[PDB]
Every structure is written in C-alpha cells, then in structure tokens.
C-alpha cells in the first residue's frame, strides 16, 4: 500500500529518560499504546486526578500538566521496497517534537497544531527491523486553553516510488460551478527524485458517490531535468452534483502516473463542487444562493478524550452541532486535525480555518511568538497546501485578537501573510479575528478580504458609512447578547453571520462563563470555560435553548427555571466587560424544601403568545415582543408537578413544552448512540447513563458514584461528566454523575463479537447495554 496508518503499537514513556532515542535502550518495561495519545488527559503518576491546583498551567490549561514525554515504535520494512522513499507523516504533536530514527536525529518540529512529513528514506533499513523515537517537549504556559501532550493525531506511513506525487502538491478548483456544467482544474506538483527523464502520462479520473467515472483526462508530460516538474488540465463535468450544507455531495479525483502501462503513483482526492462569492451588498453566496453563516467557534479538544482526536469523536461534534442549528464553525485558533475537516465535507458544514493565535508579541514567555519570525512560513503553508481542497473551508484566517494591531510594524506582517496565503489560494477570502476595533485599525483590515469582528456589535453600521464595501462578520459573540448580535446580522447585508464563543465547551481558560476575567488561581477546581452552546459531555445548554429561538423556522419553545441559590460560587470581583457568561438557569423542576416559594421561569420562544401552566392552573399569556427579546418570564410559587407552556402564532396553538419534576431513582438508563461498530481499534461508542424515575424523568439531584466495567475485546478510552468543577480522573473506570448523568467511551478491539457494559451504583439494579463489533 502507499498510504497506511501507522498508529499501531507504540511504546510510551511519560517524562524525560537518557538515551531514549538508541536502540541499545531497554523498552521491554514502557507502556504499550495506540495513538492518538494525550497523557495530560491521564492522571498525575503517583495521584489519582490529572488537575492539581499548582500547576504551570493555572486557568489557561484548566489547571492541567504537561512535561517532557518520549514515544518508541520498532517497526519492520520489507526489502522488496527497496529503492522506494520512505516517509512519515504526523498530523500533530504538541508540541517541541524531536525525531530519530535508527539512532540519528532526524528533524524537530515546534508548532503543535500543524502537520508535517518527515523523508526517513536515508535513514531505514530494508528487510529488517527500524526504530523510530520521539521527544516531546509541552513545557511551561504556552496557550490560553488545555492543549494536550503527546502525537493526539493519527499518523501515517507513505512508500512511493522516486517519481511520485508531492504531499498536499495536487490542488483541486472549480472555476466554474453552475448546475448546468462544472469545470474542474488539477494542478499538480511531480517530484522528480533521482532527476530522471523520459516521458509519463498523467491521467485523471472524476467519480462519482458510486464509483462511476464521469470525466477522464489524459497529459502527456516530458519529464524535465529539475526535480519538480507542474502539471495540469481541467474537466468538463456535466449536471454536477453540487456541494452544499444540505446535499454534501462528495466526487473523488484520482490522479494516475503512468509509464510503460505500469502505475507509477496513485492518489486519491474527495472534492466537492461549489461556487462560494462574498461582497457588501450582497453578503455570503453559496451556489448562487444568499445565506447567513450560522456559525460557533469551537476548540481542539474532546473534553474526556483530552486532545485525542479519534475520527468517531471529530465527527461526532459536528453531528451534534449540525443537530443544534450551527452550519458553520470557526477553527480556534489553530488548525484542526484533518477527520474534523473530513466529517465536515461529509456532513455539510462551513469552516473557517485559523492559523494562529499570536504573531510576534505572544500572550506568555514561552509561546510560539518567539519562533514566529523563523517558523510562520512553514506553519502557515502547513494550514494552507493541507487543507486547501476541502470544500467545506470557505475561509483562511491568519490570527485571533493581534495585539498593536495598529502599529505600522504590524500591519506589514499582515500584508505579508496575506500575501503568503495567496500564492498558495486566491479561490478562498483572507480574514482574521479582530478585537477592540478603531478607527486607526483601518490599515490592519485593509488587507483583508472579509473583516471578522470580535465583539464590536456597536460599529457595524459606522464602518460600513466609512467603508462601504467592507464585509463583516461577528468572528466571536457573548452568549448573553445573542438577540442583539444576530440581529446586526439579519438588520445588515455586509454582516453575514456570527460565531457564538463558544458552541462547544473546553477545558482551559476556566470559568469564563461563570467566574470570568480577570483570571484568578484560586478558582480551581474551576476546570471547564463554561461558555459553550453544548457542554463538555455534549448535551445541550439553556444558551442552546435561545439562540435555537433565533435561528428555526419552525415554532420553538423552552421552559427553563432560575435556581433558588447559585449552582456554583459567584465570583465579586468579575469585571464589567467579561459578559461570556449566560444567566443562571437549568432546566428541571425539582426544588425540595422551597415550596410555596416564588421561582423564576423563563421561556425561550420564537412564538408570537405564550402561556404558563402549573399543574393545569394558568399563570397568565404573555405577548412575546420585541422588548423581551425572545424572553418570557414568570414568577411561580414552587410545587411538585408539571410546568407548561402553550405557544401561540396568528392566534392558533402551535406547540406544547413540559417540564416536570423527577420523582425517586430507581433504575439506570443507558443508551449508546452506536450500537454497531467497526473492530479496528479505533471506533469509538459513546455511551450516556442516567438516573432516572419510575417514569423514565432524569434526576438532576442524583450525584452517585457509578462502577463500570467492560465484557470482550474492548476498552473504556475514558469516562466524564458535565461538571465544571470536577477534578475527577477521565481514565477511570468509575466516576460520579453530575445532574443524574456521566458519560463513558468505549474504544474497540480487533476481534469481531459482542461487546458487555456494566453499571453499577448503590441501591440499584444492576443495568448492561450490548454493542457488537463487526470485522
């Protein structure tokens, strides 16, 4: 094969350890492990929880540790392949990596966010046994959020003959997109190893979602004298398919080197067609059609599964936040592993793809800021030629909040990485998330395409007078202003959409959501930010509730109730302008000891009337104007039962919410959303329990210890639940739940069969759910 995955069988040993590269080493004792891998995420040795309150992360990595950590994998080449280039590729390593291989240093790479390929066909041996050794080095505060440590990506092993394509050189456009016809250009990019010549044909080949050739073309190339020679022809495709966030069409462009009949290289590229356009008077323009980018930001991390980015859990996000109304996604601020991208070409979803963080004034000592002025080309042509032919990229941001974004030092490495970005793609806006926007800022935005705006709802419409054809976007947005943020986007055509902070929920920057800045220590255990659309479990938060209110057509409505007391500690010393976090509210009716005590609830709803019921007894209709701001209140008097809300348009009733009080625990629920996975280690099955009533309500008093345990060729990758303040361990085999639930990951095996969770918590019965692995 040319491409396979080289996850498989690594050997781990966590901190520093002499002569951790030679073969002469003894590693029969290390910890065998298959990537991705993130021990930050796993306890601290010798303590049972992986946060600790003086850690040199503090708030920003929520309280975590990284250190220096080493990787060893013996792997064995044929000696048939002899002759062949050997290289490894890496998707990620955070961070300060150091390979050898075969006891010779092979390169070091610093950014932990980006891929690279490393060429180790001069340092292995055929028809025996390599060893390959990493050092990874994440010390110190180096990021604002938890980061992970260790190869939390997938990696792969390439073996191609010496003319073969060049890694990320084939870049696939679609000039012409209408439903009619559809032009396709490949470019690509040989390399000429060993500088030899003659002739080869190029052919190329478009399929469609079955595998049916729909245009094939074929180049013959004279192979030059230079060890790159570019190539390139376009197709005629006739009524494509066209790619969009409600039919993500996929096609695939397979690029063949031919010589003497014989196939030299073969690659493989899933493209889809669409035609993408952006201006002031018309906003954002998908396939011709105008629409509002409905967009969140979210960050790297998989909550209980720490930075490990399984392709089951990249993908799982984006199923939860395509159910949740988002249609596109900010990147922040790095690039993201390449399976999120995938789900989000398969699944029809907008991406804007961010490169950095900080340019050359950093947020701590230690950060990539001291490296940028060496390092940016690699990192950003790295975003760039990896990611380039993803039809769900609409976006290339080049950093987050600048700082001196006005001073003239600045603004040229603004136009410098533009530019950068445009000899690599001009098919795609320039963009970056700006903060603290004045007037002399102009020189900072001028270079770009589309100007995101980070939290400066208040100069839409006076910048657009300055500069009318500036396009804008809310790049980040408060979750307590979410009605007046949307409405800048729908009230103006230069304004195309808006990205909450956050959709999903992260570890790292803690408690800005509840306690905010200034970021203290002494918050701890404060882990989770606390500012997500979705918790870290997934499950969806009264924010959610809202903004659903400003973005269905369909008629919503959700009750939610303001607890009597503050679900965690109040911070007093918040400051006027961290408002990330959301009102105080959850979403059940069960509040023993204050009866007959006046409780506020409030329904979200997009609904013209809505009325109240408690227990069948109205408590008043409410007209849903625009003053209350899709905000209906009302002060009821607690009582065990059932709230209701009856909503009204055009004086009709449209829908019905229910909120009603749990009664006792008595059974578990379990429930996973595949039941049915794939056995290669890799599949993942994420599986949700809840304390439930005699009539199935979820308990949100319930906090029991719960004991798992797992029957056949499987593991538990990691266990969790939604609170914030936990310190509990993710790699455990038990953990309490938070709210009447927790959530627990099963990770397969390679043996096909039936796989048995068990659950077990004091004065239940014990409850199991059946998953099968298959192949």
Known sequence: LREQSFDEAWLFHRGDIAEGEKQSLDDS????????????????????????????????????????????????????????????????????????????????????????????????????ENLIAVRVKNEGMNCRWYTGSGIYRHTFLKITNPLHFETWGTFVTTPVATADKAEVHVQSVLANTEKVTGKVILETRIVDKNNHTVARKEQLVTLDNKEKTEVGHA?????????????????????????????????????????????????????????????????????????????????????????????????????????????????????????????????????????????????????????????????????NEIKNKETAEIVDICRELTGFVKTLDTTRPVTAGVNSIVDATDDFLAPLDVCGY?????????????????????????????????????????????????????????????????????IFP????????????????????????LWSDAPVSHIVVTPPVPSFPLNPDKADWSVWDFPDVVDHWNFPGYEGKKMTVSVYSNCEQVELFLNGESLGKQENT????????????????????????KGGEVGTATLESAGKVEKIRLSADRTEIVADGNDLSYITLELVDSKGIRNQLAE?????????????????????????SFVANSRKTW???????????????????????????????TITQKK
């Open 29 to 128: 004792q290390w910890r065998q492990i298959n990537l991705p891998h993130d021990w930050s995420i796993e306890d601290i040795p010798g303590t049972n929880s992986p946060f600790t309150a003086d850690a040199a992360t503090e708030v920003a990595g929520g309280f975590t540790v990284g250190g220096t950590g080493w990787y060893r994998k013996h792997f064995y080449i044929d000696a048939a392949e002899k002759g062949k280039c050997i290289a490894v590729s890496f998707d990620g390593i955070y961070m300060n990596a150091d390979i050898w291989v075969n006891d010779r240093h092979v390169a070091n790479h610093v950014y932990g966010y980006t891929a690279f390929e490393l060429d180790i066909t001069d340092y292995v041996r055929f028809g025996a």
């Open 626 to 649: 625009a003053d209350k701001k899709n905000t209906l209140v009302w002060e009821v008097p607690y009582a065990h039962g059932i709230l209701k809300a009856v909503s009204y348009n």
């Open 526 to 549: 404060w882990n989770h930010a606390n500012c997500g659309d979705l918790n870290l479990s997934g499950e969806r938060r009264p924010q959610s509730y809202l903004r659903e209110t």
């Open 739 to 769: 709210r009447g639930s927790n959530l627990l990951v099963v990770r397969s095996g390679k043996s096909s069969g039936r796989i048995i969770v068990t659950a077990k918590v004091k004065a239940l019965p014990v409850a199991s759910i």
């Open 454 to 522: 980070n939290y400066c709802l208040n100069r839409y419409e006076s910048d657009a007078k300055r500069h009318p054809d500036r396009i804008i976007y809310a790049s980040e947005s408060y979750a307590s202003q979410a009605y007046d943020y949307w409405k800048g986007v729908e009230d103006h055509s230069w304004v195309i959409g808006d990205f909450i902070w956050t959709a999903f929920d992260y570890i790292g920057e803690a408690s800005i959501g509840w306690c905010g800045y200034p970021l203290d220590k002494r």
């Open 235 to 399: 197709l005629e495709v006739l009524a494509p398919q066209l790619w969009s966030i409600d039919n993500p069409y996929l096609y695939q462009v397979v690029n063949r080197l031919l010589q003497d009949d014989k196939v030299i290289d073969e690659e493989y590229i899933s493209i889809g067609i669409r035609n993408i356009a952006f201006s002031a008077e018309n906003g954002f323009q998908l396939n011709g059609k105008s629409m509002k980018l409905k967009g969140g930001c979210i960050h790297h991390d998989n909550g209980l599964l720490g930075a490990k980015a399984f392709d089951r859990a990249e993908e799982r996000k984006i199923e939860l936040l395509k159910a949740a109304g988002f249609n596109a996604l900010r990147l922040s601020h790095n690039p993201p592993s390449i399976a999120l991208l995938n789900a989000c070409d398969r699944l029809g979803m907008l991406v804007i793809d961010e490169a950095f963080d900080m340019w050359r004034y950093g947020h701590y000592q230690y950060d990539y800021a001291q490296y940028f002025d060496k390092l940016w080309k690699e990192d950003l042509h790295s975003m760039v030629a990896r990611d380039r032919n993803h039809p769900s990229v609409i976006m290339w941001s080049i950093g």
């Open 704 to 728: 029991e210890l719960v004991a798992f345990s797992i029957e056949g060729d499987a593991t538990i990758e990691g266990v969790g639940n939604a609170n914030p303040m936990s310190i509990e």
